[PDB]
From Swiss-Prot:
This is Phosphatidylinositol transfer protein CSR1. CDD domains: SEC14. InterPro entries: CRAL-TRIO_dom, CRAL-TRIO_dom_sf, CRAL/TRIO_N_dom, CRAL/TRIO_N_dom_sf, PITP/CRAL-TRIO. Residues 113-273 form the CRAL-TRIO domain. The gene is CSR1. Belongs to the PITP family. PANTHER family: PHOSPHATIDYLINOSITOL TRANSFER PROTEIN CSR1 (PTHR46590:SF1), PHOSPHATIDYLINOSITOL TRANSFER PROTEIN CSR1-RELATED (PTHR46590).
Length: 364
């Protein structure tokens, strides 16, 4: 639950986005020297109409407020630094990421993206279940990593597909973050590629704020000690404080239940980590249903329109805590619930099914 002071910051961020998008709003009462209608320097070179549409297509299974609050909390409730971070994210993201997740593995395979395919087939990073708090778990096995198997751009695209798949596993009323299990058993100098580590730190700290729950480094060999003594100094202190070194199955149980821990680590998850089954396309039957997709997209446009105008009313309303303000706050919750429900309706019509849709682990 947001305090009064925190709700002011939330309203300020929406106001900046609204001025960029040319959504009518007056933020005078809740303010950077605020000048009504002027676009924040962090946003001054984004296209109003393009970014307005792109933002709402990236919105899938998380509420609009929750999406923004991850940037706000990352920047410690500083509105000017939050809006800078959001602006850089919108410039970087555009429609690239939405295309990756909607295209899924099938698009990668159809386009002969050899390096991305190799990483999928190696199961170098896979979603293996849920942690004790219902966060998705990504199992990463660096012993499978060789610089020669992919370009850096291909490794980047692969990593982004994986994190976007993990977001689809987020459970309502549970932490919207991911637990990472880096299994270091078998790590060798053959695997010592610092380029991807610098990219993951740099790019994921900037573009997936407040997305990390626990980062487990499991059975690190002695040869990893001098490598960790380099890498650790590159980390944001908050990210560093989420890292735990585990040595055995009992230590993993503090974070993940046995049904989800792979059998080879001492768990009961018998997923085949040695042979990959790419999506065969049999669940993509609805992608061709233009008529139904168009209906759901029009319902979405109407919900977004109402969310925008109600949020603008809520930004301006004075005083707080009267019956009309309560009703506005509740209407924003109801519209957010409806947008989430609408995304669940839309998903089969726009996103090609991942391996996790076929194996029963993912239900959106």
């Amino acid at each position: 639950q947001l305090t009064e002071d925190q709700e002011v910051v939330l309203k300020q961020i929406w106001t900046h986005l609204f001025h960029l998008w040319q959504v009518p709003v007056d933020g005078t009462h809740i303010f950077h020297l605020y000048e009504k209608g002027k676009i924040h320097k962090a946003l001054a070179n984004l296209d109003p109409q393009t970014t307005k549409k792109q933002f709402w297509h990236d919105i899938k299974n998380e509420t609009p407020d929750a999406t923004i609050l991850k940037f706000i909390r990352a920047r410690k409730w500083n509105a000017d630094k939050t809006i800078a971070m959001l602006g850089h994210d919108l410039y970087w993201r555009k429609d690239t990421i939405n295309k990756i997740i909607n295209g899924g593995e099938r698009a990668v395979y159809e386009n002969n993206e050899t390096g991305v395919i190799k990483n999928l087939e190696l199961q170098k990073a896979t979603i293996q279940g849920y942690d004790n708090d219902m966060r998705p778990v990504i199992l990463v096995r660096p012993r499978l990593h060789h610089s020669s198997d992919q370009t850096e751009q291909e490794l980047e695209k692969f990593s982004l597909l994986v994190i976007e798949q993990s977001k689809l596993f987020f459970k309502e009323n549970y932490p919207a973050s991911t637990t990472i299990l880096f299994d270091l058993n078998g790590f060798s100098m053959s695997n010592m590629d610092y380029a991807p580590v610098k990219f993951l730190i740099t790019c994921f700290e900037a573009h997936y704020p407040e997305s990390l729950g626990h980062l487990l480094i499991h059975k690190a060999p002695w040869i990893f000690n001098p490598i960790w003594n380099i890498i650790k100094n590159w980390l944001d202190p908050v990210v560093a404080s989420k890292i735990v070194f585990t040595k055995n199955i009992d230590e993993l149980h503090k974070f993940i239940q046995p049904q989800y821990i792979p059998r080879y680590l001492g768990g009961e998850n018998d997923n085949d980590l040695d042979h990959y089954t790419p999506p065969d396309g049999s669940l993509d039957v609805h992608l061709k249903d233009t008529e139904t997709r168009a209906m759901i997209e029009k319902e979405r446009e109407e919900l977004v329109e109402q969310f925008l105008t109600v949020t603008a009313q809520w930004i301006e309303h004075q005083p707080l805590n009267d019956p009309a303000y309560i009703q506005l706050q509740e209407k924003r919750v109801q519209l957010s619930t409806a947008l989430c429900e609408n995304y669940s309706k839309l998903d089969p019509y726009i996103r090609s099914r991942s391996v996790y849709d076929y194996n029963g682990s993912l239900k959106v």
